[PDB]
Design a binder for this molecule. Structure first.
Ligand code: 4YZ
Ligand code: MG
Length: 717
């Protein structure tokens, strides 16, 4: 065929060529040695990879049987826990330890703030995310509902001064709250000067300095009329841009044009659940963008490029620089899937996670070298890889061994390849300390991946009985315990000042007032970072890190244990007679709509993340984990007789045209209705639900990938 032979491997040519021509030059890695390394690591680690996947299946079969064999109404927690221990699911917790991970950048070890996640196959989005380190607070306030569109203050086609004024006043208050003046308010400022290394703020009847002069980090322009003033609070920078010759500056009492906030200080470039990549061509598109980001030369159509560092004058008068870019992680795929980018002599596809480590690892070397500017990414010499969907410490150890072996192939120092552990599978949750210990010399974060975690929750106890509704899951005892337990594990392992303790995505992209009002819970909970779906939401979530002293919050949580194993293990079973018929129908429609809405963009257009209108037309930006949840929940309800297979069909058929109409503003869209059996997307949605109970841990990829490939093939013939 078209493939390249390397040992027992047959490498898709598009991949072979990309690596030889694009990825390898400049890494000083001998191309032949590299490919021999690929062959050898794949040969050596494939059996253990398959062994771990089989173990998941066996543990799940035993749990299914445990539930099927009993008919008591309340779960005997003591017996359940004993059983889980006996089968090797719940492992002993190791003695206290402190992570030793080193060579990590300050953005990760020290700085608390928002973290962006973006699909790596979308070059423009990736570039926007990387540039989102600094963002306009005025743009974020004016452009969203954080400033209400009440009478007189609504967005028009052109600039509304009443709205602009609300924006200005909101930000003045932020300034008062974050970097307080000794006396008076920023709301009454008339100017800013730097005198003998001190920030002086002019008021009407007097002048004043900062309550804490140390929050003054610098400025631009002349000290006697700066163009901007740089502040710092809780390690995050705040920049006041001064220019009366600007749209809003002319209206402003101190000539202030904008307030820029340091926002997304880290960004995860995603190869997993926000992208649709099912063959060699898709992986190469992803790898090519990852390469462009690391070499610093990625450029997208509508011409977008990466930002340079930002130049400042220190308070004393000396010069310095700050990073202009969000520090990048890459999220590899997990241990499950294979991909035909490489097959063996049998035609057997190679594990995609192994490939990701080799290739995203190889590619990240460019981020440690000069960009033809200074190097793009890690100044401390680390490569940062988020690893999703791991179950238990053995799976964590395997990943670490994979990274070690890749480090050899790449001629990299051991432990160069750091690991962001997603805690989004129940067997990881209940063995979290052990998972951290397995990666104690590589771990740079843990994060509560809650949509996925809920999917795993449902699949794991699928045989136990009907689960509560999807909307109910977010407030269930198990998940609230999971959230605290994650923080507790991290802090006890010494994450404070060493590694990120992260929480999940705000998915409601247009509900920013709600985000600002409520997402503050996450840093109040001791999280040094949390996920936001866009640069705009990053700028807004930043506010939370100014109001909350995360470092202090973490210090106060030290040595506390706020969740028991019993709480973690509390299965979200719905109570008897929980739902009226109408509520059941709502929930079915809800879930069928969320499956159809997402699947149709995935299968038809290879889009894995977008603003998808939900059943109530609320814009949600969710990755593939939303599919895992909805399909598992419906499968759970079908399994326990809450709904019939005709209910599912009727809902699918009822919701399909609604999704069709929701996609009206898209020229590439093909209506699913009314020829359902001719729509691969519709059939994919159906299959995910009807085959849901039989998918390993409820994973949707084997079905989704097959259907997407099916669509790709039909579109060519
Ligand atoms: O990882 C999980 O389990 C859920 C993460 S939610 C998410 C939404 C959107 C994008 Cl672009 C990325 C992630
Ligand atoms: Mg996930």
């Amino acid at each position: 065929t078209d493939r390249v032979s390397v040992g027992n491997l047959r490498i898709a040519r598009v991949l072979y060529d990309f690596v030889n021509n694009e990825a390898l030059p400049g890494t000083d890695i001998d191309p032949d040695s590299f490919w021999a390394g690929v062959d050898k690591v794949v040969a050596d680690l494939t059996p253990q990879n398959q062994a771990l996947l089989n173990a998941r299946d066996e543990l799940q079969a035993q749990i299914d049987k445990w539930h099927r064999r009993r008919v008591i109404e309340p779960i005997d927690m003591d017996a359940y826990r004993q059983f889980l221990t006996e089968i090797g699911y719940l492992l002993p917790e190791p003695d206290d330890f402190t992570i030793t991970t080193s060579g990590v950048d300050a953005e990760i070890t020290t700085t608390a703030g928002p973290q962006l996640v973006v699909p790596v196959l979308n070059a423009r989005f990736a570039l926007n995310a990387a540039n989102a380190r600094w963002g306009s607070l005025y743009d974020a306030l004016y452009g969203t509902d954080v400033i209400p569109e009440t009478d007189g203050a609504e967005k028009g086609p052109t600039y509304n001064k009443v709205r602009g004024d609300k924006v200005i006043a909101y930000a003045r208050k932020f300034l008062d709250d974050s970097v307080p003046l000794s006396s008076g308010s920023f709301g009454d400022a008339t100017g800013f000067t730097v005198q003998d290394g001190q920030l002086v703020v002019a008021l009407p009847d007097k002048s004043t300095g900062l309550a804490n002069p140390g929050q003054f980090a610098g400025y631009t322009g002349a000290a006697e009329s700066p163009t901007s003033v740089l502040l710092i609070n809780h390690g995050l920078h705040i920049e006041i841009l001064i220019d009366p010759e600007s749209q809003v500056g002319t209206t402003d009492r101190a000539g202030v044009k904008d307030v820029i906030l340091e926002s997304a200080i880290t960004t995860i470039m995603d190869f997993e659940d926000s992208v649709a990549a099912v063959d060699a061509a898709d992986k190469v598109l992803g790898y090519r963008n990852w390469l462009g980001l690391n070499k610093g030369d990625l450029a997208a159509a509508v011409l977008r490029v990466l930002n340079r560092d930002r130049n400042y004058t220190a308070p004393g008068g000396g010069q310095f620089t700050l990073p202009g870019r969000s520090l990048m992680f890459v999220r590899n795929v997990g241990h499950l899937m294979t991909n035909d980018a490489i097959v063996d002599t049998d035609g057997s596809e190679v594990f995609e996670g192994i490939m990701d480590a080799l290739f995203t690892g190889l590619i990240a070397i460019h981020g440690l070298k000069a960009s033809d500017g200074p190097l793009i990414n890690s100044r401390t010499g680390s490569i940062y890889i988020v690893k999703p969907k791991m179950h238990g410490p053995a799976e964590v150890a395997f990943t670490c061994e994979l990274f070690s072996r890749v480090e050899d192939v790449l001629g990299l120092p051991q432990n160069t390849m750091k690991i962001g552990i997603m805690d989004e599978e129940r067997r990881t949750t209940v063995n979290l300390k052990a998972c951290i210990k397995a990666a104690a010399d590589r771990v740079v974060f843990i994060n509560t991946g809650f949509l996925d975690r809920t999917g795993d929750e449902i699949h794991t106890s699928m045989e136990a009985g009907p689960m509560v509704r999807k909307g109910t899951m977010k407030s269930q005892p198990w998940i609230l315990a999971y959230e605290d337990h994650n923080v507790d594990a991290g802090l006890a392992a010494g994450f404070s000042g060493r590694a990120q303790v992260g929480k999940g995505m705000w998915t409601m992209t247009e509900l920013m007032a709600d985000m600002v009002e409520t997402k503050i819970a996450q840093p109040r909970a001791g999280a040094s970072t949390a996920w936001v779906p866009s640069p705009t939401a990053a700028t807004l979530h930043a506010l939370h890190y100014h109001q909350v002293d995360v470092a202090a919050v973490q210090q106060g949580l030290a040595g506390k244990r706020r969740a028991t194993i019993e709480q973690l293990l509390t299965i979200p079973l719905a109570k008897e007679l929980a739902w009226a018929p109408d509520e059941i129908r709502e929930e079915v429609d809800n879930n069928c709509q969320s499956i159809l809405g997402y699947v149709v963009r995935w299968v038809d257009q290879g889009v894995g993340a977008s603003k998808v209108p939900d059943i109530h037309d609320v814009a949600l930006m969710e990755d593939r984990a939303t599919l895992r949840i909805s399909s598992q929940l419906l499968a759970n309800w079908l399994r326990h007789g809450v709904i019939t297979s005709a209910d599912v069909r009727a809902s699918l058929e009822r919701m399909a045209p609604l999704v069709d109409r929701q996609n009206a503003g898209d020229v590439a869209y093909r209506p699913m209705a009314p020829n359902f059996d001719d729509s691969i997307a519709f059939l994919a949605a159906q299959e995910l639900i009807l085959s849901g109970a039989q998918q390993p841990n409820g994973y949707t990829e084997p079905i989704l990938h097959r259907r997407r490939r099916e669509f790709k093939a039909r579109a060519a013939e």
